[PDB]
Design a binder for this molecule. Structure first.
Ligand SMILES: [Mg+2]
Ligand SMILES: [Zn+2]
Lengths: 1223, 717
RNA sequence: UUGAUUUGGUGAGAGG
DNA sequence: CCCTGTCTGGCGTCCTCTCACCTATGA
DNA sequence: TCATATTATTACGCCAGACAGGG
């Protein structure tokens, strides 16, 4: 069964693997994030309720009044989205917050408040999201791009090689909170443990232990195990568990029980450990040279004399043993400092420590954190107890506590947001364990260690900034509060919240202007994962590994769609099936595989879960039950693609599109292209302009439907039914009764957005693709947007392309185009320019909007009214007048009248005017005369434009040939576009050839149907040929149910197929070559894909037959009459005497540094002298040169450049006396 | 405001913005001669406004300047003749935006274009590194008269036909034209007009055009090659060459002095480059310019007539490929069955798997390379006979147009063992090429390997540019300022030899550099060349005939000139045939020529002889052992292999105390081992014999007793 | 004597 | 007193094009 | 409108060059 615009033109779908999970809604990141931000969600998480339950109830410092919270709300926007874009306002909503002030008496923690008051106060306006995932910030339509940042929670990083210049590794450990102070632990090459807070000075780390009220003995209890020396009959014997001797040299005689176990000289093996455990050896008598290097654990005091024997962490000598033996402390606890495993790092750090108690530890930490200003008991204790341990200024979130408990192998995952003693001690213990050998480091590119921020999280953080500023203001007003003469808007202020949230949505590194020239480009700018932004890395610094693809990107981030240039791999784009985890990580679908039978249930995993399991490959042959047809299958275990058994796997990939994104899964024959050319192909495919006549890719992938629907450029029907079709203004849909509400009788009236400006000056336009009185279903499309054709996605157009060299006109990457491409207007795109004119009151009275234009004669009053402003629609070009806008006293009158820029033509499509109340409306103040004029240039195609296919084959269209000179085959049809075969062996993008052959076969079927329907046959022969065309070959998913198309839906389908039968070649499970040959045999075309072609010039055959087919070629928006520029003489800058830069400023070319070196490389001394003195800077030289040229005397009078005298005055404006010496 | 990249020096005084300048997208236009470029009419009327004003005021059409500005603001019918009369002999400087060396600013003559795109002659593109994928170039106008003469006499595109970094021509025909030539001058074992006889190249082209022969059909023609064997006199010799039709048609374009054997071969890209190079060395500049244009025209025309497409059938899969993959799969199965039973180590397993996949990769490449290089087997008048193939991808590879062995390997054979970003290789290769489909995991490993390359180029370019900046600011001053420093010192140019075959010959190092003292002929005490002669190609051939050892030649670092470099101690001009002129800045062209290839560079037992010759030792102090093998008492001994002629062909470094199988001045055989040592055991060998005493060797403090475990023969350690 | 403001500076994206 | 970690400064590619956004206070 | 005058984040990678510490 199919829907009714699905039976219009059903695309022949190759593809063998049955898909189990349909594609999710492609804008779900933006929409789910912002629906989390604004939603009335009780239990508090997450949203605006989390912000209000953190900041409220505010109580002042015993001021006996406590403003509390009830509920919030967002009213209607005063401006709907269209008139909001037209006017220039934000698309926002007012945030109505109920606030309940209760005010206490004296001595009421428990007492009832003396008075209440409550009102629905107004704080800020928050910008709502449009239904397509965009904002409208100040007239322009912007997009917040989801960030990719390091997760909160501990990270054990190594930095193995570069420091110390000696090959000795370090090991640092960063506890990254979501909000607050950063705590890092780090070794130094003396093997001492150092703490630093917020990248400040370096403190030896155990001082933080001494700041947590730990004595030295408790610290040595934590990080060391005790070895017991018992004072006995002679020589102070030792308790010896045999584990401690692992891998060391026997220094003494190891004997017990009257038996010599191990003699001196040999190392202790594990067999000797087994001998000591079998022989039950604990107590052995040691020599006095064994204790002469060990370190005491706890303190001991001489009992009778009443003084100290030794402090804790003191090494022992023989006379120290003579001190402690004669006193009466029989047990001696020593620190086992194994050189192999259990290193003495804490103990040597305690030897570095200049402190002894808790108070001096806090004084040293306070002198680290805030220097100069004195360290007193209260101040240092408040500092250190609010560094990590208060809920205000330090908060590992739920993500942070999950990562923090997971990296320490804790059992639980939910806990308190602050740290504790035990958490810092566990981070130090795991760091020491990593130094000892057990456990390993973490990598930072691993996407289980890399969280995503999105729109709701970022706006919530900015809103929390605004709320803590307004609670400091409420605490300000309340202690100065007199009652009862205030109601809660003398306390609260709507200004800081609105200021902060408009600061983020207007001027941030991620709230950025939407790439809007294409439905693909909208839908792939909204699905973007940037590594940049606040708190993340920068473009010009890092690095090599964060720019590189890591094995956790499989199914989360597209491997091949990343922009080339200065930021590669920082601006990653999200995969097709990848959702976002509850904590913000990237979870991708897999199919749960209990045993041999691969089950059709799906189950989502992130990269810290994908490592443990064994996950299969998407295309592994399984037949009729889910059993893998082989006994061994390629899977990947822990980021390592390896071959495993038939019955070991726990998950399988869902579908074979899932590695790549929605930009680079629209490329058919992706698997035959190179990776580089797929990258260039996807990045150029974002850049296509919408043509005037949208044209249905013959070789698509079937993902065109989901992109063209899910990006909101087409008018998808909300409720199904029939149609009334007034449509000149709006589609009117009568609703079927089952989908129709009992009250609100109701018929749906869709607004078509006609010719208007996009963000890239292209033309967004919707056209109805349903007739009058025609059934439509829910979810069906009604109006085709820009670059769409019956709900599919038509960026460029499909043209007949020959691969051959043609007389040099397609030399490096150029492209030679017939005249049939430019006669049919089949790339003639439509651009729209907005031009503003204002008549602000700068000085000497206000400016004026009158046709009575001066000096200039009846060449002003022309495309305007009888007395002012461009009339409505003519063919205006360059140098015309649109809005007469000139003042008197500015003879002394002048011409600021906004005219048409140089080089452009067009038709005035629209004139908007919300001018200074007097022009003879709704807008803001200040600005007076506000006249916006919308031109619409129609640019065709010309030598110099840029076209490209989908595979990375760039081209600048070189010659626009006549129809006659084209290479025609023996049937008579010219070929449209000639490309060059030499690009194909080097640039290994062989997929454009299979697209060429399969598009040739598609139009072969289209020509066959066009013959069977033009030379008109009764519909039995058409339905037989359509059935043969839709069966065609191997086991596929489509077949068709064609005998249920009522003898008319066969004919309407065959009316929509006579331009070529559309073929879906999916991404990695595409059409094989034998099916291309078999489809080329169904059409009457030659099997090789190659036709003999004659030459239009000479009429004689090209030897060695050439390839002709249909490639889907796109017109990119790098048009040549936006790049052509020239300057002889005009205006310059102010500070310098050199010319201005750019095209919108009529400026000249920067003759840079390497061009000066290139002229020095020749003998061009005079060319360089005029290149930097006369042509550029020296004012007397250039006026004398212009007069010398127009007299007919090519001679320069050089002089000295002005910018060098600017250099002299800037150097001389220091204390520097730079001069110019003798004649 | 002073310091930094955006201060006054680097932003307004060294580089300035410039009037009379323009910028647009480039395109091809192959009808051009290589001294002229296409320039649009709109840019031409904007850049030449003052010349048009001066011309309009000279004729008398208008009066005041205003009238002329209204005339060209309206663009009447008479200013286009004014524009064609200001263009005519007035060069312009075309400039591609990343100019790295001096060939990135070249001066052309404009030819006006209906259009909005600069038409740029194709050969010149290989100088600019300009493809046509969206590139843009700037035009600059030489205003004054000295600047027009500098654009015509120094910076004209006909004057830059040799790259200044070396002697190689930079107007080499790039990609379409070498395919047109390689298809034209080739042969097949049967065609139309096999073995017929032709009275000249004119009727060879007449037989190709009328439809009576084929472009490649072997044929006796009668060609008249002009060899200039006298002193500037061209002597005609006419003969019958057994050649093809295409070689005669291409002989109609070759100038007079070149011999016929420059076109008698198949003419790939190296052969057409040395064709233009021999034309420049013999016939000079003007025939080489006009012959470069005629090469480009006939290459484009017969590449158009060739119809050399690319198909899906052109990438021939080897029939032996699947059995090679199954034999490799059986081998990894044997290695992993040993790994389950623990017979072998893990590193040796990884090494054995990478070795068998490298061997299977080489075998798949040889299978496809046989299956492409000789696939065509066509009969002529009887039994079959084989030849090199006319497969399209094979001509695009063999011609050197675009493609190599590796790229055509990845389109047909397996695409190797791609490496993960850890730097180590992956043990499971990508057994599927691009004609077969890559599945998902194989494409993901491929994306590892290609993302690393894009990140390397996009970060490598900054260091390459900063290297060129540091080099042209250390050079910056050095100007050829004398004609002879008057010295006798200079460095000793030898051929360089690493230990394999002789890498860079002496003719590459002492080409065009003036000798320091007069080179003795290798026989005895002869004045072969004098002591201040430039060594051009004729002198270097008389050096190669006499097999001259090494030349003491004058180097720039030995120049005695205060504040500059004299004209002899620099050498040849390199893009001019003569010595460097008094004046030409050599520091800047040298700094650009070192730093310009910064993009192409990357960023991130005993001795076995190969040839058969004579032994010689240097830095040697040796002694004969008891067995006879001459051992060496010097660490720094150089073992040279000198041939029977006198030049040095091999060199090696032999350590202190090695077992030499041979001796001094001896003759050996090719492949015979002549050296042996143990680097893990430093020999403490002697000079004389006698008895051994342990001086200051006491067991317990100095040395220790470690009796060996598994052997029993102890040693005092 | 016949007319006028971006360069300045930041951020984001793109081309070669 | 000669090695020595450690800290502080100083580099990090040219050319071009499009867009938006710009200090608070205050009797 | 017309003078008043500066605070609550961290996440580069060498590579010279100068400086207090200690055998
Ligand atoms: Mg390019
Ligand atoms: Zn000299």
């Amino acid at each position: 069964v199919y829907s009714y615009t699905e039976k219009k033109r059903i695309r022949k779908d190759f593809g063998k693997r049955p898909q189990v999970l349909d594609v999710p809604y492609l804008l779900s990141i933006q929409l789910d994030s912002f629906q989390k931000f604004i939603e009335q969600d009780p239990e508090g998480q997450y949203g605006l309720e989390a912000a209000f339950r953190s900041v409220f109830p505010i109580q002042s410092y015993s001021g006996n009044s406590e403003l509390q919270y009830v509920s919030y709300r967002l009213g209607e926007p005063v401006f709907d989205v269209q008139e909001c874009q037209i006017r220039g306002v934000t698309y926002s909503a007012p945030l109505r917050v109920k606030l309940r002030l209760v005010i206490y008496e004296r001595e009421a923690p428990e007492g009832t408040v003396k008075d209440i008051k409550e009102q629905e106060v107004y704080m800020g306006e928050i910008p709502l999201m449009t239904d397509n995932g965009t904002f409208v910030i100040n007239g322009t339509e912007r997009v917040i791009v989801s960030q990719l940042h390091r997760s909160p929670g501990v990270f054990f990083d190594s930095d193995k090689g570069k420091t110390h210049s000696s090959g000795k590794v370090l090991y640092n450990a960063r506890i990254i909170p979501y909000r607050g102070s950063w705590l890092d632990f780090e070794f130094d090459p003396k093997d001492n443990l150092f703490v630093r807070i917020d990248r400040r000075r370096k403190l030896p780390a155990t001082i933080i232990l001494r700041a947590l009220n730990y004595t030295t003995e408790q610290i040595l209890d934590l990080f060391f195990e005790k070895v017991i020396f018992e004072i006995r009959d002679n020589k102070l014997q030792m308790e010896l568990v045999p584990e401690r001797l692992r891998g060391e040299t026997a220094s003494f005689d190891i004997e017990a029980n009257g038996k010599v176990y191990v003699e001196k000289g040999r190392r202790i093996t594990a067999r000797h450990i087994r001998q000591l455990e079998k022989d039950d050896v604990k107590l052995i008598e040691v020599p006095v040279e064994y204790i002469a290097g060990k370190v005491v654990a706890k303190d001991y005091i001489d009992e009778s004399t009443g003084e100290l024997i030794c402090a804790a962490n003191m090494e022992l000598s023989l006379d120290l043993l003579a001190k402690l033996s004669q006193s009466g402390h029989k047990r001696i606890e020593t620190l086992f400092t194994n050189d192999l495993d259990h290193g003495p790092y804490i103990s040597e750090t305690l030897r570095v420590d200049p402190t002894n108690d808790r108070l001096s530890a806090l004084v040293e930490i306070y002198r680290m954190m805030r220097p100069g200003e004195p360290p007193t008991r209260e101040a240092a204790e408040s500092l250190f107890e609010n560094l990590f341990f208060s809920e205000d200024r330090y908060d590992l979130s739920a993500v942070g506590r999950m990562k923090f408990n997971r990296s320490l192998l804790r059992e639980e995952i939910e806990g308190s947001g602050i740290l504790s003693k035990d958490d810092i001690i566990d981070v130090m213990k795991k760091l020491i364990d990593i130094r000892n050998g057990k456990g390993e480091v973490d990598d930072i590119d691993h996407l289980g260690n890399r969280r995503i921020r999105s729109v709701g999280e970022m706006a919530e953080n900015q809103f929390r900034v605004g709320l803590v500023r307004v609670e400091r203001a409420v605490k300000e007003r309340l202690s100065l509060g007199d009652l009862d003469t205030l109601m809660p808007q003398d306390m609260i202020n709507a200004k800081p919240i609105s200021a902060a949230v408009k600061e983020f949505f207007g001027s941030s590194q991620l709230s950025q202007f939407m790439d809007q020239n294409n439905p693909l480009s909208e839908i792939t700018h909204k699905r973007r994962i940037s590594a940049l932004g606040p708190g993340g890395l920068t473009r010009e610094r890092a690095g090599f590994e964060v720019r590189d693809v890591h094995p956790t990107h499989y199914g989360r981030v597209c491997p091949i769609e990343t922009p080339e240039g200065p930021n590669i791999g920082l601006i990653n784009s999200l995969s097709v099936y990848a959702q976002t985890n509850e904590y913000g990580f990237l979870e991708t679908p897999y199919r749960k595989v209990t045993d041999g039978v691969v089950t059709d249930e799906i189950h989502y995993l992130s990269a810290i879960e994908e490592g443990n399991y064994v996950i299969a490959q998407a295309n592994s042959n399984l037949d009729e039950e889910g059993h893998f047809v082989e006994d061994l299958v390629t899977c990947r275990s822990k980021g390592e693609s390896s071959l495993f058994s038939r019955d070991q796997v726990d998950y399988m990939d869902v579908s074979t599109q899932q590695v790549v994104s929605v930009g680079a899964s629209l490329i058919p024959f992706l698997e035959h292209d190179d990776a580089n050319r797929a990258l260039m192909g996807a990045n150029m495919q974002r850049q296509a302009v919408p043509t005037l006549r949208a044209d249905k890719p013959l070789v698509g992938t079937g993902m065109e439907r989901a992109v063209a629907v899910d990006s909101g450029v087409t008018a998808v029907a909300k409720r199904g039914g029939v149609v009334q079709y007034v449509d000149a203004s709006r589609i009117v849909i009568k609703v079927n009764e089952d989908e129709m509400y009992p009250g609100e009788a109701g018929i749906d009236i869709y607004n078509l957005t006609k010719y208007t400006r996009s963000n890239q000056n292209t033309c967004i336009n919707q056209m109805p693709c349903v007739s009058l009185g025609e059934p439509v279903e829910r979810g069906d499309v009604l109006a085709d947007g820009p670059s769409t054709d019956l709900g599919e996605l038509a960026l460029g157009q499909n043209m007949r392309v020959a691969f051959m060299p043609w007389n040099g006109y397609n030399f490096e990457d150029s492209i030679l185009v017939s005249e049939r491409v430019v006669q049919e207007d089949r790339f003639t795109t439509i651009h729209i320019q907005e031009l503003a004119c204002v008549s602000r009151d700068t000085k000497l009275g206000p400016e004026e909007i009158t046709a009575d234009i001066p000096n200039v004669g009846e060449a002003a009053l022309s495309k305007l009214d009888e007395s002012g402003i461009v009339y409505i629609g003519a063919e205006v070009t360059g140098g015309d007048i649109l809005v007469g806008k000139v003042t008197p006293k500015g003879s002394d009158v002048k011409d600021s009248s906004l005219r048409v820029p140089n080089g452009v033509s067009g038709t005035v499509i629209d004139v908007q005017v919300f001018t200074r109340d007097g022009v003879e409306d709704d807008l803001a103040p200040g600005v007076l005369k506000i006249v916006k004029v919308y031109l619409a240039v129609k640019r065709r195609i010309q030598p110099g434009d840029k076209m490209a296919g989908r595979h990375g084959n760039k081209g600048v269209i070189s010659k626009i040939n006549p129809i006659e000179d084209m290479p025609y085959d023996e049937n008579g049809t010219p070929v449209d576009i000639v490309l060059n075969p030499l690009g194909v062996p080097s640039r290994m993008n062989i997929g454009q050839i299979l697209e060429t052959h399969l598009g040739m076969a598609a139009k072969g079927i289209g020509d066959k149907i066009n013959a069977m329907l033009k030379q008109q046959q009764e519909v039995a022969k058409l339905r037989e040929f359509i059935q043969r065309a839709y069966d065609l070959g191997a086991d596929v998913r489509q077949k068709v149910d064609l005998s249920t198309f009522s003898d008319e839906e066969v004919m309407r389908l065959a009316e929509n197929l006579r331009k070529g039968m559309p073929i879906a070649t999916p991404v990695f499970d595409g059409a094989k070559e034998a099916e291309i040959k078999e489809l080329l045999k169904l059409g009457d075309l030659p099997t090789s894909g190659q036709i003999r072609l004659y030459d239009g010039r000479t009429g004689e055959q090209f030897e060695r037959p050439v390839t002709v087919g249909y490639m889907y070629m796109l017109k990119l928006n790098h048009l040549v009459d936006d790049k052509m520029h020239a300057r002889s003489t005009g205006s310059y800058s102010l500070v310098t005497q050199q010319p201005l830069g750019g095209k919108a400023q009529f400026g000249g070319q920067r003759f840079g540094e390497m061009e000066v070196w290139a002229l020095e490389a020749y003998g061009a001394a005079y060319t360089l002298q005029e290149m930097l003195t006369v042509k550029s800077d020296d004012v007397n030289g250039r006026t004398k040169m212009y007069k010398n040229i127009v007299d007919g005397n090519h001679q320069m009078e050089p002089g000295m450049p002005e910018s060098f005298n600017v250099l002299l005055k800037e150097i001389r404006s220091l204390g520097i006396n730079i001069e110019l010496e003798d004649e | 405001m002073i310091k930094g990249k955006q201060g006054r020096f680097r932003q307004n005084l060294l580089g300035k913005r410039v009037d009379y300048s323009g910028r647009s997208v480039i395109t091809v236009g192959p009808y051009l001669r290589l001294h002229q470029c296409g320039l649009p009419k709109k840019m031409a009327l904007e850049l030449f406004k003052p010349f048009i004003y001066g011309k309009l005021e000279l004729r008398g059409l208008a009066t005041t300047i205003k009238a002329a500005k209204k005339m060209v603001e309206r663009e009447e019918a008479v200013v286009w003749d004014i524009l064609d009369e200001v263009i005519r002999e007035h060069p312009v400087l075309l400039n591609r935006a990343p100019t790295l060396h001096r060939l990135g600013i070249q001066a052309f003559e404009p030819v006006l274009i209906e259009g909005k795109a600069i038409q740029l002659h194709p050969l010149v593109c290989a100088a600019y590194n300009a493809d046509f994928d969206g590139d843009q170039m700037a035009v600059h106008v030489p205003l004054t008269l000295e600047a027009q003469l500098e654009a015509r006499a120094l910076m004209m595109s006909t004057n830059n036909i040799l790259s200044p970094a070396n002697g190689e021509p930079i107007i080499v025909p790039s990609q379409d034209v070498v395919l047109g030539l390689y298809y034209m001058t080739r042969d097949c074992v049967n065609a139309k007009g096999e073995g017929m006889v032709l009275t000249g190249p004119k009727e060879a082209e007449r037989l190709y055009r009328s439809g009576l022969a084929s472009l490649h059909a072997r044929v006796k023609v009668r060609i008249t090659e002009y060899e200039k064997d006298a002193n500037g006199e061209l002597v005609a010799k006419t003969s019958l060459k057994d050649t093809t039709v295409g070689r005669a048609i291409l002989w109609m374009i070759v100038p007079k002095g070149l011999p016929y054997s420059i076109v008698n071969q198949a003419l790939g890209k190296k052969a057409i480059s040395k064709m233009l190079n021999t034309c420049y060395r013999i016939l000079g500049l003007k025939p080489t310019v006009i012959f470069a244009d005629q090469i480009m025209y006939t290459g484009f025309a017969y590449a158009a007539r060739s119809g050399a497409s690319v198909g899906i059938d052109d990438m021939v899969i080897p029939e032996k490929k699947h059995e090679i993959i199954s034999e490799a799969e059986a081998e990894v199965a044997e290695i992993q069955e040993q790994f389950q039973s623990g017979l072998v180590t893990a590193g040796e397993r990884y090494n054995k798997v990478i070795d068998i996949w490298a061997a299977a990769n080489d075998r798949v490449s040889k299978a496809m390379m046989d299956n492409l290089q000789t696939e065509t087997v066509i009969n002529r008048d009887g039994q079959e006979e084989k030849q090199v193939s006319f497969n399209s991808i094979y001509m695009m590879a063999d011609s050197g147009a675009r493609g190599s062995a590796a790229q055509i390997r990845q389109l047909a054979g397996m695409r190797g063992l791609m490496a993960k970003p850890d730097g180590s290789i992956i043990e499971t290769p990508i057994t599927a090429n691009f004609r077969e489909g890559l599945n998902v995991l194989q494409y993901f490993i491929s994306t590892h390997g290609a993302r690393k390359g894009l990140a390397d180029t996009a970060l490598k370019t900054a260091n390459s540019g900063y290297l060129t900046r540091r080099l042209v600011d250390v050079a910056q001053d050095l100007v050829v300022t004398e004609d002879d420093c008057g010295t006798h010192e200079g460095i000793m140019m030898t051929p360089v030899i690493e230990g394999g075959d002789v890498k860079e010959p002496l003719r590459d190092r002492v080409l065009g550099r003036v000798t320091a003292e007069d080179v003795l002929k290798p026989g005895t005490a002869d004045i072969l060349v004098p002591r201040n002669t430039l060594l051009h190609e004729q002198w270097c051939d008389l050096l190669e005939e006499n097999s001259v050892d090494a030349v003491k030649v004058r180097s720039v670092v030995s120049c005695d000139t205060d504040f500059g470099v004299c004209a002899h101690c620099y050498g040849r001009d390199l893009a001019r045939g003569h010595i460097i002129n008094k004046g030409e800045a050599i520091g800047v062209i040298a700094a650009q020529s070192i730093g310009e290839p910064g993009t192409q560079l990357t960023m991130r037992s005993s001795i076995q002889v190969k040839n058969k010759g004579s032994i010689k030792l240097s830095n040697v102090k040796s002694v004969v052992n008891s067995s006879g093998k001459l051992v060496i008492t010097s660490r720094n001994t150089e073992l040279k292999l000198i041939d029977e002629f006198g030049r040095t062909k091999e060199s090696y470094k032999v350590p202190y105390g090695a077992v030499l199988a041979k001796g001094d001045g001896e003759q050996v055989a090719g492949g015979e081992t002549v050296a042996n040592w143990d680097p893990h055991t430093m020999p403490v060998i002697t000079e004389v014999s006698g008895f051994v005493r342990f001086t200051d060797m006491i067991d317990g403090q100095t040395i220790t007793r470690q009796t060996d475990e598994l052997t029993g023969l102890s040693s005092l350690v």
